[PDB]
Amino acid sequence: IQNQLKKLQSPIILLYCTKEEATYIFEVANSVGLTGYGYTWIVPSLVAG
Amino acid sequence: IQNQLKKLQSPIILLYCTKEEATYIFEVANSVGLTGYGYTWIVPSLVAG
Structure with missing residues (x-):
């Protein structure tokens, strides 16, 4: 989770399906x-x- | 801590004094x-x- 969230360079995040x-x-x-x-x-x- | 470590853009980190x-x-x-x-x-x- 932290290894992927390190490389984030967006101003915006689109979404998957799940809710919990x-x-x-x-x-x-x-x-x-x-x-x-x-x-x-x-x-x-x-x-x- | 996270608010400061968000903005980090270095390849290198220099050091303070304390040890614990x-x-x-x-x-x-x-x-x-x-x-x-x-x-x-x-x-x-x-x-x-």
Whole structure:
């Protein structure tokens, strides 16, 4: 997770399908330092649910 | 710690004085993902001890 999040150079993050893993990956992005305002997220269905 | 380590763009890291904090900051660089081979460290005295 940290090895992949090291190389991130985006202003924006598009999304997969899952939702409990979306909660967990919100948690790992919080513990990495990703969540504040350097990125924004487009949410399709099944993550909104 | 994560807010400062986000902005790091070096191949190299120079050093402060303390040593128990050097152990603790080795720990936080491990939990960030800094330690492997993207950086190298020059060690003065009182960190070597």
